[PDB]
């Protein structure tokens, strides 16, 4: 899967929901 589609916005498992 293309991991650049996930947007990591803080330490750990903190992502933006797209």
């Amino acid at each position, epitope marked *: 899967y*293309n*991991k*650049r*589609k*996930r*947007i*990591h*916005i*803080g*330490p750990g498992r*903190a*992502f*933006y*929901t*797209t």
Partner: antibody, heavy 123, light 107 residues
Framework: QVQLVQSAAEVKKPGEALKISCKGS????????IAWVRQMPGKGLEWMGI????????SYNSSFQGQITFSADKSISTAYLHWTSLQASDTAMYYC????????????????WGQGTLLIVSS | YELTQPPSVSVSPGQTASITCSGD??????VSWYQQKSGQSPLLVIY???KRPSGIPDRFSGSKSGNTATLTISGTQAMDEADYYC??????????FGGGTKVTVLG
């Protein structure tokens, strides 16, 4: 070197459609998200949304959903911001900006910005 | 929806300019800072709270304590006069900027 180069100033009327462009060079354009940012004169930066150029996936500030869409033409490394019906309040400066990478993922900062496109909307 | 910054900071050349940015999302979210000179595009000067891009002078530093991030410019120079914006991400609402701080280097 990474460059984002935006299309020229626009002067339009309310109700008209418009798309403005952001062409990225110096990297793999399809692989980095592009944000679009609005700045009314003398005011701050406001986020409109983001588009991923490899697949045109978009995420919007829902206050602008329904007035704007994004797209990308990967063959010429360009992303677009569209309106189908302008209003006078769309007068502002618009920037595109590249979201950078962190680790294996995209990151949280915009590491390169376009030079801006000034839009004036008036009857 | 904006993070909170002071509207204006004024310092003489050589003095430290300290710009704060606070918001309830900042404690666990990376803060970025951009410099926007008059008539120019924003330029990233700090990301992930404390990291400097290449080509940014070491006189710009960022820090963060709880819900408040601070951009410190030490040895401020005239060319550092600009508006500075902080930024972070709300997990569902996306990119949140501060309101901006106009830093004047007094001449």
């Amino acid at each position: 070197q990474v460059q984002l180069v935006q299309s020229a100033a626009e002067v339009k009327k309310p109700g008209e459609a418009l798309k403005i462009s952001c062409k990225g060079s110096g990297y793999s354009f399809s692989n980095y998200w592009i944000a679009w940012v609005r700045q009314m004169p003398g005011k701050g930066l406001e986020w409109m949304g983001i588009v991923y150029p490899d697949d045109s996936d978009s995420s919007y500030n829902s206050s602008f959903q329904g007035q704007i869409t994004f797209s990308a033409d990967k063959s010429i490394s360009t992303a677009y911001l569209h309106w189908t019906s302008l209003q006078a309040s769309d007068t502002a400066m618009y920037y595109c900006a590249r979201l950078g990478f962190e680790g294996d993922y995209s990151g949280s900062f915009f590491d390169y910005w376009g030079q801006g496109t000034l839009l004036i909307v008036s009857s | 929806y904006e993070l909170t910054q002071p509207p204006s900071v004024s310092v003489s050349p050589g003095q430290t300019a300290s710009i704060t940015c606070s918001g309830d999302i900042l404690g666990d979210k990376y803060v970025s800072w951009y410099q926007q000179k008059s008539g120019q595009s924003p330029l990233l000067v700090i990301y992930e709270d404390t990291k400097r891009p290449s080509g940014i002078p070491d006189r710009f530093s960022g820090s963060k304590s709880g819900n408040t991030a601070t951009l410190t410019i030490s040895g401020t120079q005239a060319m550092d006069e600009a508006d500075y914006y902080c930024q972070a991400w709300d997990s569902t609402l996306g990119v949140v900027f501060g309101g901006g701080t106009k830093v004047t280097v007094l001449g």
